[PDB]
Design an enzyme around this catalytic site. Sequence first.
Site, PDB file in Angstrom:
ATOM      1  N   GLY A   1      -7.833  16.828  22.905  1.00  0.00           N
ATOM      2  CA  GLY A   1      -9.177  16.392  22.479  1.00  0.00           C
ATOM      3  C   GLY A   1     -10.214  16.638  23.560  1.00  0.00           C
ATOM      4  O   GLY A   1     -11.366  16.956  23.206  1.00  0.00           O
TER       5      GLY A   1
ATOM      6  N   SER B   1      -3.229  13.976  26.915  1.00  0.00           N
ATOM      7  CA  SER B   1      -2.289  14.760  26.069  1.00  0.00           C
ATOM      8  C   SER B   1      -1.773  15.988  26.834  1.00  0.00           C
ATOM      9  O   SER B   1      -0.644  16.403  26.557  1.00  0.00           O
ATOM     10  CB  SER B   1      -2.927  15.144  24.759  1.00  0.00           C
ATOM     11  OG  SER B   1      -4.136  15.858  24.973  1.00  0.00           O
TER      12      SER B   1
ATOM     13  N   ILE C   1     -22.256   6.307  19.520  1.00  0.00           N
ATOM     14  CA  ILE C   1     -22.492   5.479  18.297  1.00  0.00           C
ATOM     15  C   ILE C   1     -21.176   4.794  17.917  1.00  0.00           C
ATOM     16  O   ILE C   1     -20.284   5.479  17.388  1.00  0.00           O
ATOM     17  CB  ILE C   1     -23.051   6.306  17.123  1.00  0.00           C
ATOM     18  CG1 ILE C   1     -24.345   7.032  17.493  1.00  0.00           C
ATOM     19  CG2 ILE C   1     -23.238   5.418  15.896  1.00  0.00           C
ATOM     20  CD1 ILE C   1     -24.999   7.746  16.334  1.00  0.00           C
TER      21      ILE C   1
ATOM     22  N   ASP D   1     -13.378  13.407  31.369  1.00  0.00           N
ATOM     23  CA  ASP D   1     -13.281  12.094  32.053  1.00  0.00           C
ATOM     24  C   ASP D   1     -12.652  12.336  33.428  1.00  0.00           C
ATOM     25  O   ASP D   1     -11.640  13.055  33.499  1.00  0.00           O
ATOM     26  CB  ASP D   1     -12.495  11.094  31.204  1.00  0.00           C
ATOM     27  CG  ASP D   1     -13.075  10.890  29.814  1.00  0.00           C
ATOM     28  OD1 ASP D   1     -14.291  10.639  29.717  1.00  0.00           O
ATOM     29  OD2 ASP D   1     -12.307  11.014  28.833  1.00  0.00           O
TER      30      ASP D   1
ATOM     31  N   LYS E   1       0.854  -1.227   0.000  1.00  0.00           N
ATOM     32  CA  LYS E   1       0.000   0.000   0.000  1.00  0.00           C
ATOM     33  C   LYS E   1       0.864   1.241   0.000  1.00  0.00           C
ATOM     34  O   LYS E   1       0.519   2.174  -0.772  1.00  0.00           O
ATOM     35  CB  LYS E   1      -0.970  -0.001   1.182  1.00  0.00           C
ATOM     36  CG  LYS E   1      -2.129  -0.966   0.941  1.00  0.00           C
ATOM     37  CD  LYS E   1      -2.790  -1.383   2.255  1.00  0.00           C
ATOM     38  CE  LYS E   1      -4.231  -1.860   2.069  1.00  0.00           C
ATOM     39  NZ  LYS E   1      -4.284  -3.200   1.451  1.00  0.00           N
TER      40      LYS E   1
ATOM     41  N   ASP F   1      -8.914  14.967  30.885  1.00  0.00           N
ATOM     42  CA  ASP F   1      -8.815  13.712  31.675  1.00  0.00           C
ATOM     43  C   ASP F   1      -8.271  14.056  33.064  1.00  0.00           C
ATOM     44  O   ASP F   1      -7.150  14.595  33.136  1.00  0.00           O
ATOM     45  CB  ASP F   1      -7.944  12.700  30.930  1.00  0.00           C
ATOM     46  CG  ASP F   1      -8.363  12.548  29.479  1.00  0.00           C
ATOM     47  OD1 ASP F   1      -9.532  12.170  29.242  1.00  0.00           O
ATOM     48  OD2 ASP F   1      -7.543  12.860  28.599  1.00  0.00           O
TER      49      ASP F   1
ATOM     50  N   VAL G   1     -20.229  10.391  16.118  1.00  0.00           N
ATOM     51  CA  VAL G   1     -21.152  10.774  17.228  1.00  0.00           C
ATOM     52  C   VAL G   1     -20.776   9.942  18.459  1.00  0.00           C
ATOM     53  O   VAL G   1     -20.712   8.704  18.343  1.00  0.00           O
ATOM     54  CB  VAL G   1     -22.631  10.588  16.843  1.00  0.00           C
ATOM     55  CG1 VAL G   1     -23.560  11.034  17.961  1.00  0.00           C
ATOM     56  CG2 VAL G   1     -22.972  11.318  15.551  1.00  0.00           C
TER      57      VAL G   1
HETATM   58  C1  LIG Z   1      -4.479  -4.275   2.434  1.00  0.00           C
HETATM   59  C2  LIG Z   1      -4.842  -5.558   1.693  1.00  0.00           C
HETATM   60  C3  LIG Z   1      -5.559  -6.529   2.625  1.00  0.00           C
HETATM   61  O1  LIG Z   1      -4.708  -6.813   3.739  1.00  0.00           O
HETATM   62  P1  LIG Z   1      -5.480  -7.473   5.133  1.00  0.00           P
HETATM   63  O2  LIG Z   1      -5.036  -9.129   5.782  1.00  0.00           O
HETATM   64  O3  LIG Z   1      -6.851  -6.513   5.863  1.00  0.00           O
HETATM   65  C4  LIG Z   1      -5.967  -7.846   1.943  1.00  0.00           C
HETATM   66  O4  LIG Z   1      -4.784  -8.477   1.443  1.00  0.00           O
HETATM   67  C5  LIG Z   1      -6.976  -7.716   0.795  1.00  0.00           C
HETATM   68  O5  LIG Z   1      -7.949  -6.694   1.033  1.00  0.00           O
HETATM   69  P2  LIG Z   1      -9.509  -6.986   1.336  1.00  0.00           P
HETATM   70  O6  LIG Z   1      -9.829  -8.254   0.574  1.00  0.00           O
HETATM   71  O7  LIG Z   1     -10.202  -5.754   0.803  1.00  0.00           O
HETATM   72  O8  LIG Z   1      -9.579  -7.130   2.840  1.00  0.00           O
HETATM   73 MG   LIG Z   2     -10.832  11.489  27.637  1.00  0.00          MG
HETATM   74 MG   LIG Z   3      -7.840  13.098  26.337  1.00  0.00          MG
HETATM   75 MG   LIG Z   4     -16.360   7.513  17.498  1.00  0.00          MG
END
Ligand SMILES: *CC[C@H](OP(*)(=O)O)[C@H](O)COP(=O)(O)O
Ligand SMILES: [Mg+2]
Ligand SMILES: [Mg+2]
Ligand SMILES: [Mg+2]
Length: 326
Positions: A180, A171, A97, A247, A63, A183, A94
């Site tokens: 952020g 931090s 969530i 926190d 990558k 704490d 959010v």
């Molecule tokens: C970055 C490529 C992925 O590495 P991972 O073991 O999450 C996979 O080789 C292929 O990508 P995916 O099929 O989209 O998960």
């Molecule tokens: Mg915190």
């Molecule tokens: Mg913090």
């Molecule tokens: Mg979140």
Amino acid sequence: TLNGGITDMLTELANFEKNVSQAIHKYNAYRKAASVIAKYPHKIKSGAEAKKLPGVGTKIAEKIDEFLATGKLRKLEKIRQDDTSSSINFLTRVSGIGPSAARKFVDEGIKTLEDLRKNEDKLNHHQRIGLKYFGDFEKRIPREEMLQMQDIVLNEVKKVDSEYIATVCGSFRRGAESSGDMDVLLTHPSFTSESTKQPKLLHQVVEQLQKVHFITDTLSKGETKFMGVCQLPSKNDEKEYPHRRIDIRLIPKDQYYCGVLYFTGSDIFNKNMRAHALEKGFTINEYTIRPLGVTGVAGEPLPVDSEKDIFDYIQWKYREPKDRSE
DNA sequence: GTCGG
DNA sequence: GCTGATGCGCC
DNA sequence: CCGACGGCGCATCAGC
Ligand SMILES: *CC[C@H](OP(*)(=O)O)[C@H](O)COP(=O)(O)O
Ligand SMILES: [Mg+2]
Ligand SMILES: [Mg+2]
Ligand SMILES: [Mg+2]
Ligand SMILES: Nc1ccn([C@H]2C[C@H](O)[C@@H](COP(=O)(O)OP(=O)(O)OP(=O)(O)O)O2)c(=O)n1
Ligand SMILES: [Mg+2]
Ligand SMILES: [Mg+2]
């Protein structure tokens, strides 16, 4: 921002694996890789160079080569243009969530900010307050405002009982120019690993901070951990300060050093330090460092008289709070 | 996704 | 009730 | 290739 492009790409991939795929270990793998690359004091030229760093394997190397060649990642380009992935990523911003609730809401047709405000009835209390302050919680806190918040909390805590010690961690204690959220590590002589000599020790501090209108909302509250919302007071005619996350963690006073180590972080430093402890046959939490037996069962707490003592046990050179950040 | 055994 | 599992949170 | 990946507080829910 030396290797900014690469660390941004890895963070975005981490957030996808956590929020959409619900693959916590792939999330941790991407954050670890992002962290090691951020500290690397050279401009990375190839994936093969990145691959030499710990936490960067074959797939991240591939990558990085793609990114350095094209300036982007087809995988991310596609994630960005997919409605369900994009919707889940937004909703997860959010407070209250997570990945599960987000996917549930997207299935019910709730995918936008307007959809959330139209369906407040469908949100729990935490999620209601997350929606209310969505804008405010996006904003970081300048250190100048953190120093003002520190002055309020420490002085207000002192008013309740002069035996309380409050320490601002996260931090802020790592010396960041913005945070952020706030704490607060809290101790009282009457709460130790051995006895709770006084009840409602945390409650009394929360009440006092509510009384002077510093704490404005509660997300969750128990005997040892408060999670809520606060706000600096503003002067006449001037715009209100944004609402901020707070926190407060009450830690046994005899377990302060394990507590302040935990609460200073960063989160990735804690994971790396705790992972390293296991390799050395120890387990660290916010209370104790314990040795592991032949079985893999945690023994009795070891004596800790300083933060450095915990580093010495796992044979790490002491890192000051400022050198524990990402 | 990575890596030490 | 209680317990144990899960979700979401903290660093 | 494989098991492990940090550790835990509070809110909520299923099952009894
Ligand atoms: C970055 C490529 C992925 O590495 P991972 O073991 O999450 C996979 O080789 C292929 O990508 P995916 O099929 O989209 O998960
Ligand atoms: Mg915190
Ligand atoms: Mg913090
Ligand atoms: Mg979140
Ligand atoms: N919330 C807190 C903060 C501190 N302490 C205790 C631990 C130590 O015994 C002492 C101060 O330790 P710190 O790590 O806070 O030290 P400082 O850096 O603030 O000051 P100094 O270097 O003078 O010790 O107070 C505590 O019980 N609860
Ligand atoms: Mg490597
Ligand atoms: Mg954080």
